[PDB]
Amino acid sequence: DEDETTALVCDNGSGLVKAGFAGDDAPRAVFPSIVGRPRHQGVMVGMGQKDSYVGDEAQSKRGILTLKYPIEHGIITNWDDMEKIWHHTFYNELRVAPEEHPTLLTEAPLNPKANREKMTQIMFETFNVPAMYVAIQAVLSLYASGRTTGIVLDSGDGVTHNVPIYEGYALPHAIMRLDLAGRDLTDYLMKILTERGYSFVTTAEREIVRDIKEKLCYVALDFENEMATAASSSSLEKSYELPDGQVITIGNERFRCPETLFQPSFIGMESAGIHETTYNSIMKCDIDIRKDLYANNVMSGGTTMYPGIADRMQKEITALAPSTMKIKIIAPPERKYSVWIGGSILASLSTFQQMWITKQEYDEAGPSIVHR
Amino acid sequence: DEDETTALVCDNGSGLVKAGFAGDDAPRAVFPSIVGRPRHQGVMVGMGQKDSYVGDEAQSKRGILTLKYPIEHGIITNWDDMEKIWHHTFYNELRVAPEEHPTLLTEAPLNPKANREKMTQIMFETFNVPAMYVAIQAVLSLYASGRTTGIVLDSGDGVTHNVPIYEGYALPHAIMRLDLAGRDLTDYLMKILTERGYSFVTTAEREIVRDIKEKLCYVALDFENEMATAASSSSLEKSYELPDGQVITIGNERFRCPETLFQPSFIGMESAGIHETTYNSIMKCDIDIRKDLYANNVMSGGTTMYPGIADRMQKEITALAPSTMKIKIIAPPERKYSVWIGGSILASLSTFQQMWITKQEYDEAGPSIVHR
Amino acid sequence: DEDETTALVCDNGSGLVKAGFAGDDAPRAVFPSIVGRPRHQGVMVGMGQKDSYVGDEAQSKRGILTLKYPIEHGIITNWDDMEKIWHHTFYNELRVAPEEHPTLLTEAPLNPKANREKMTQIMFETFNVPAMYVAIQAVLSLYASGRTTGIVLDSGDGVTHNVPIYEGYALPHAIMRLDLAGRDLTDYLMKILTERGYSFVTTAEREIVRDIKEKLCYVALDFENEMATAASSSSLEKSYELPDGQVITIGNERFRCPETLFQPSFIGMESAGIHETTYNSIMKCDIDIRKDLYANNVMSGGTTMYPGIADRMQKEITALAPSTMKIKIIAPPERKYSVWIGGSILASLSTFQQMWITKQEYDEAGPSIVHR
Amino acid sequence: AADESERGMKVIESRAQKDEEKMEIQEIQLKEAKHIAEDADRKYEEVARKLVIIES
Amino acid sequence: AADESERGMKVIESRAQKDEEKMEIQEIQLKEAKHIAEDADRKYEEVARKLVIIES
């Protein structure tokens, strides 16, 4: 129990932090990855002067603060502001004292060696956690779907990745990163919806375009004869009621937004798209392992939640793969937390105890110890 | 000559229409983009009952009419009232019959496909012009400064834009629109001038604040130590004599008004300003084309006429751009008509004849034909 | 003179074409081996609609065209697009009419019999050249270094080869091909340089990583205690100034890039490396000829130009070869054109006239004639 | 051969710096001279138009 | 070391020529711009003096 209860799992994202206790089924804490700094001197009624704001209080009060994102494209870019988000996570969100909890953290696919050593330096030397561990994100997603070999298409708020994993070892030279994700996708909907003849003028109009994207957006299979369908004008249309009455209608654009993930050309991106990239990762791997990867395309991440994403991907890679092959696109329902759940499982596991980096290992080996 | 003489160029703005014959050096007709509708029944001496008023007669008689602006932020918002401004342009202002003149029109940067088809529907089907053509405004401004690749900062009465153009094709995904222009700017001067201890009480006081803005306003470089200069009180001050004697003095505010274009925060705008936006457009474009855009910042529009606008912009983007770069801010003297002049050149050109959309093309292809 | 002046030498590569007149000291024409096909309909100012683009106009205009490489790994893969590059070479680059010039062409090491017959079919039947000849590339490189027996390590843009040659006959069963060359090498530098904490974001950032590789990259001897040296941080570092000011520094990676040629494991390649492969070629040859090959390791190709390549190879094979042996690594300065120069010499030669395949031979013997 | 070519390099690099500085100081003196030429040539067309209207 | 220092010499000598040409073309464009700025600054001191007398 000492640490059975006690292991923490913190998944640091570009848009959201997911956090909680190893053992739980889902994150106890989910909140924006921002750190707000007040543009002016003054106070809220009853509070003192605050130097900084994090998560939702930074979002809610955004009009008087300069908002900053510590993690650009999955990599920690500002370490002063990240230690601020961690502090908030332990002390306010989970309300635990960190110096008696083992902490499993996550990093990104080709996270620079030096960063994995730096967050270890900050975990052990400024938070004084007993022990910690850094798992790679795609690797926890895979594992949370039971398996050990597969290829994960991972897509969240600032990055998309393909991480081919074989008997647990993520394959460095076959990993692909595509910098277009849910953030890019909300801003494109924004324009095709103002372009539908609308105005997201106040900040209460801006924010909810993102809630339109999440609730009403679709990834149609045969996106071709779906536009064609749009035109005959079926009961395909969908009206959402705004903060007030102002019933906005979205028929068609509803799927023009996730067609951006297959066609980056919709947004002036010259890069290849999700399905081709799944494939290219795969023809960059060893030959003998390619049947395995093909029957185990595990999807994780908030942006892979658009319904019919899996069917489109299913047919997208069948038709690029040699017919002798078995294609299989696994997309679980909890996928917006796969990464986290894979960490919860792993860290609550009976056999993981012997991989925890302890302060004994650290004080004796330097940050190098956990770096592997 | 048939049409060498005969091509018309009509530039539709948010505040002004500029019109005339391809060939001329400047617009034959310039007038407000209003359509007045009388609030009461009655007549002027010697005239009949008039249902409507357009341009200057609507401005002059504004006290008995409800004034309406057909073009909101560069886009045509009311098509009944726009066909009224066109009618006025052909028949009264240029006094031509439209059915024997080719007409080059202009549209805005990301003008909805459907509008370009609608004004074509109205040009050919209600005015019966022989042929017409719709050019994008920034694109005519660039071309009138000789070149084909550059980025235009275009700023008039209701909109500001940045339109990066490469070998003639305006780059859709890199275009930025900032809804703060000369209209916003006259109303801010208004307040900093009443705030100087004044009153623009009657309508003959209101209108002339705009003539103060045009004649006496400046964009200082080092707007910082220009306020500082204001305080030591040099012979920086400037008194204007009103419709009557009432000599009003404007020392300082003179430049506090165009500092609004770099600091939108002066007016409760949270958007970025002109120079940052020039830049952001540029780091949204292909990499290999960014040296070109930087050495070709062409300025056009009534609001970019404030003296010292170019020097401030020069230094504003040098200091944001990588030092390996050449910055070059072209601001010609005729810039309040760049757009129009670019159309005059192009439409009087020897090679343009083969791009005119003719009634033959239209009656045979539908509005789609000119839409491109 | 008839043909003394008149012989053409065209060396077709995976990345570059080298072309010119037999007699000259270096290629009159060097340009990319691409054929661009426009993604959209439209024109450049003053030109007509172009169906296709080749060489540098395809590279310069790459944003609106789909680029294609006719020669994959030294072998011609698309014959429609190759006839396009040849056409460009004769008519635009060298501006000659082909029907009065003998043409010496080059092919790759184990070029399929059928290809040598096909380019002969296209040379004689669609270009109508008087006579032609196909030399093997390593064989021209050797010969340009004076000799007739030696082993060439040939390395360009898409392939590396080892071609043991004895009294002029390249030894089929001892030839080795390693598909990792300068193209692979620019993309690896790219990643170790973004991994140094950088961004080659626009296309003007992408292209110049290749100019960094060419100018600043090194092949260190004792690559072991060169990394060790990197750490003590000597004045080994080297900063390059980008298209703009943005001074990028490259200390160390500078040699980590050509260490890829000895260690393919740096790039997820399981194949053996350059030096081992030199050697294996050699223990696949007759016994009595192995002292000859060892004292005549001739290097040719753009990717063998990295300084200190020869010293590393010198010591790499001394220490694998029996000590009774003399090792000798010849690397001339003009080596990026060895192949071409060997062709220029040979084809301008007094004795070569009797090996030219003439239209008389062809019209009478079929493509078989030149195939040998 | 190397020592003579290093010395010449050093001298032409020093001349190149010395002239690059002169260009930048003229190029800047000129954005100034051209800008004062243009602020001058506007003030006039306002004063000469103001003259033709108060003469009329 | 000699070949790299010869190549660098060649490139900095080429840049030094390329910039020396740019200076000369600006330096000349300027005797022109300054002279038109002065031919301008005399005739509106004349036209504004002519204005103040016909306004008076």
Author numbering:
A (entry chain L), B (entry chain K), C (entry chain M): 1 to 372
D (entry chain B), E (entry chain A): 112 to 167
Copy text from the publication.
Myosin heads consist of a motor domain (MD), which has the catalytic and actin binding functions, and a lever arm that amplifies small structural changes within the MD to produce filament sliding. The lever arm consists of a small folded domain, dubbed the converter, a long α-helical peptide that binds the two light chains, an essential light chain, ELC, and a regulatory light chain, RLC. Insect flight muscle (IFM) possesses a highly ordered paracrystalline arrangement of myosin and actin filaments that provides detailed X-ray diffraction patterns and electron micrographs. Here we report on further investigations into the HST state of IFM using a 2 ms duration stretch (str-HST) or release (rls-HST) and their effect on both the structure and distribution of cross-bridges as they adjust to the mechanical perturbation.
